Amino acid sequence: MDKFRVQGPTRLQGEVTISGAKNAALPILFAALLAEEPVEIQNVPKLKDIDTTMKLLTQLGTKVERXGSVWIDASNVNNFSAPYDLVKTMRASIWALGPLVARFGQGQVSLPGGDAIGARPVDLHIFGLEKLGAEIKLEEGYVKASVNGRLKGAHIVMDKVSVGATVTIMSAATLAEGTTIIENAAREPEIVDTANFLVALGAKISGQGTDRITIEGVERLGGGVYRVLPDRIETGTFLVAAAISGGKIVCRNAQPDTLDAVLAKLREAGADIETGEDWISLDMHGKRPKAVTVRTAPHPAFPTDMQAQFTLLNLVAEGTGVITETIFENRFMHVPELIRMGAHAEIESNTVICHGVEKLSGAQVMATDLRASASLVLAGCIAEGTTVVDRIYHIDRGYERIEDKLRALGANIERVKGE
Numbered sequence: 216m217d218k219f220r221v222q223g224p225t226r227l228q229g230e231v232t233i234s235g236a237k238n239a240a241l242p243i244l245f246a247a248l249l250a251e252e253p254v255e256i257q258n259v260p261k262l263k264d265i266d267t268t269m270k271l272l273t274q275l276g277t278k279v280e281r282x283g284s285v286w287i288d289a290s291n292v293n294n295f296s297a298p299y300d301l302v303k304t305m306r307a308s309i310w311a312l313g314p315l316v317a318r319f320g321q322g323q324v325s326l327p328g329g330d331a332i333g334a335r336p337v338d339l340h341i342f343g344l345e346k347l348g349a350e351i352k353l354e355e356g357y358v359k360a361s362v363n364g365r366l367k368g369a370h371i372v373m374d375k376v377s378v379g380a381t382v383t384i385m386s387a388a389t390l391a392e393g394t395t396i397i398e399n400a401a402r403e404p405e406i407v408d409t410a411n412f413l414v415a416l417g418a419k420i421s422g423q424g425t426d427r428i429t430i431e432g433v434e435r436l437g438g439g440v441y442r443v444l445p446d447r448i449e450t451g452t453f454l455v456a457a458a459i460s461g462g463k464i465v466c467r468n469a470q471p472d473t474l475d476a477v478l479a480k481l482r483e484a485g486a487d488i489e490t491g492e493d494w495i496s497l498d499m500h501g502k503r504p505k506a507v508t509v510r511t512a513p514h515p516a517f518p519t520d521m522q523a524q525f526t527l528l529n530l531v532a533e534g535t536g537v538i539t540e541t542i543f544e545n546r547f548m549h550v551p552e553l554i555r556m557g558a559h560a561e562i563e564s565n566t567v568i569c570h571g572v573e574k575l576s577g578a579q580v581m582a583t584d585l586r587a588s589a590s591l592v593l594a595g596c597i598a599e600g601t602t603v604v605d606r607i608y609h610i611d612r613g614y615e616r617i618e619d620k621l622r623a624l625g626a627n628i629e630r631v632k633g634e
């Protein structure tokens with residue numbers, strides 16, 4: 216049971232290199248099943264889900280190898296089943312369905328029981344495929360999709376915005392006969408990245424990033440080299456580590472345009488920011504941050520995924536700031552942990568009222584949420600004394616060796632194994 220021991224306070228400054236987005240890497244990895252020729256997916260982070268996906272792919276008969284890049288050769292897919300033994304701890308598994316039936320005419324994916332830690336419906340995916348002409352077979356714990364020949368482009372109106380189903384429908388539509396129009400498509404920068412990857416392979420797709428995605432099917436996709444986009448939330452997490460520590464940081468391998476709202480929010484906090492084609496610079500000038508008002512909402516507005524981070528910023532800022540969750544419920548569970556560190560806050564309705572204090576005090580903390588947990592480490596860096604962040608495996612799930620990045624920024628951090 217790994218833990219993080221942090222010695223504070225320490226100013227976080229210097230350089231950090233941003234890892235690729237797991238969330239853009241996953242769907243691209245699955246989409247590669249469409250590729251007739253070898254493919255090189257660069258900038259893929261070293262995370263658990265990537266491994267599971269690697270195993271899943273190999274199981275299909277795909278040739279797979281990795282380092283910074285992941286090499287894929289899907290020329291010989293022979294097996295069409297994603298056994299219960301894989302879709303286990305990985306929702307993303309579902310992404311194998313579409314490419315399979317779209318390219319091979321048949322695909323089968325395992326589905327966790329009606330109520331076993333993942334009763335999460337995948338109805339949208341299924342119905343989207345059916346809409347594209349796939350024959351669907353459901354028996355409960357398994358889902359089969361098949362088609363005689365090619366899938367057929369369709370005008371598909373989404374009743375619920377879904378990053379997951381948008382990927383499934385868009386991916387499968389590239390090999391279908393005709394044009395597919397996806398109304399109410401998810402807008403995520405990850406969707407854009409996946410669409411771009413598809414286009415690099417020879418697909419015809421437009422509207423990515425808007426409410427409307429249009430795909431014109433082609434007979435086949437080739438191979439090539441594609442670089443996965445920068446991790447927007449990781450970038451944001453680092454920018455915040457600098458903004459709460461009076462530091463100066465430059466984020467390398469970054470993508471400014473996927474962070475507009477977070478940047479303007481940082482500026483409101485008093486931060487000095489500059490951006491280039493592939494980098495972002497933040498400078499606090501030794502200054503404490505100014506309390507800010509935050510309203511999370513659908514991309515391209517302020518991302519709920521940066522919430523815990525900004526909550527921490529407000530907590531050590533000059534003045535009072537309120538964070539409102541306009542879409543999600545129960546997103547403040549971690550706050551008590553911060554209060555144990557000396558923070559002043561009130562949780563009311565879909566909001567957290569932040570009364571900034573001068574300095575935090577170290578303590579033994581723990582959060583299950585990826586973002587909130589990472590935030591506890593950030594706090595540990597600026598708090599006075601020793602802070603022990605427990606159960607950090609949650610962080611390792613979406614953060615590529617974060618202790619090493621922090622360290623290179625000046626943090627006094629230690630990965631403590633066993634106990």
Ligand SMILES: O=c1ccn([C@@H]2O[C@H](COP(=O)(O)OP(=O)(O)O[C@H]3O[C@H](CO)[C@@H](O)[C@H](O)[C@H]3O)[C@@H](O)[C@H]2O)c(=O)[nH]1
Nearest residue numbers: 306335336337338339340341375376377378379380381401
């Ligand atoms: O087939 C589907 C696919 C998605 N949804 C819903 O659509 C919403 C958003 O879809 P996406 O935008 O597809 O959400 P996901 O990325 O599929 O789910 C992720 O985001 C959720 C919080 O929004 C977390 O609870 C999940 O664990 C995480 O995998 C979610 O509330 C889903 O319940 C469905 O009802 N049916």
